[PDB]
Write a protein that binds this DNA or RNA. Structure first.
Length: 49
DNA sequence: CACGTACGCGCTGTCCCCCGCGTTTTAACCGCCAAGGGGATTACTCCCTAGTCTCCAGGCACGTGTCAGATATATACATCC
């Protein structure tokens, strides 16, 4: 995730695109909600109906 | 209180079955429709039925006299020594 994982201040991201599923959005909303995302792309949005 | 003996308890063997562990499966759990019925409230209307009241009469309780079945004698006929 981070270019500097051994730091303790502000950690900037290393990856560009994160592919994930619904189950790990619900499971890891704490570890993923505290990320300033620039874009969301939700495939099969009828699940989000 | 005396006697005596049966059984509670301790010890030992033995075998068997339950526990611990590793591996594989599998269904509980969480998150989803898809519509529809059950049920909890809020408000309203209506009507049947149970409380209340008055009056009376017979059911229940008590007491007492009798009465038919069960029990205990009174006297007469049959019978043993």
């Amino acid at each position: 995730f981070y270019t500097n994982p051994r730091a303790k201040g502000k950690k900037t991201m290393k990856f560009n695109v994160l592919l994930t599923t619904y189950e790990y959005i619900l499971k890891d909303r704490a570890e993923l909600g505290s990320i300033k995302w620039q874009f969301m792309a939700v495939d099969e949005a009828h699940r989000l109906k």
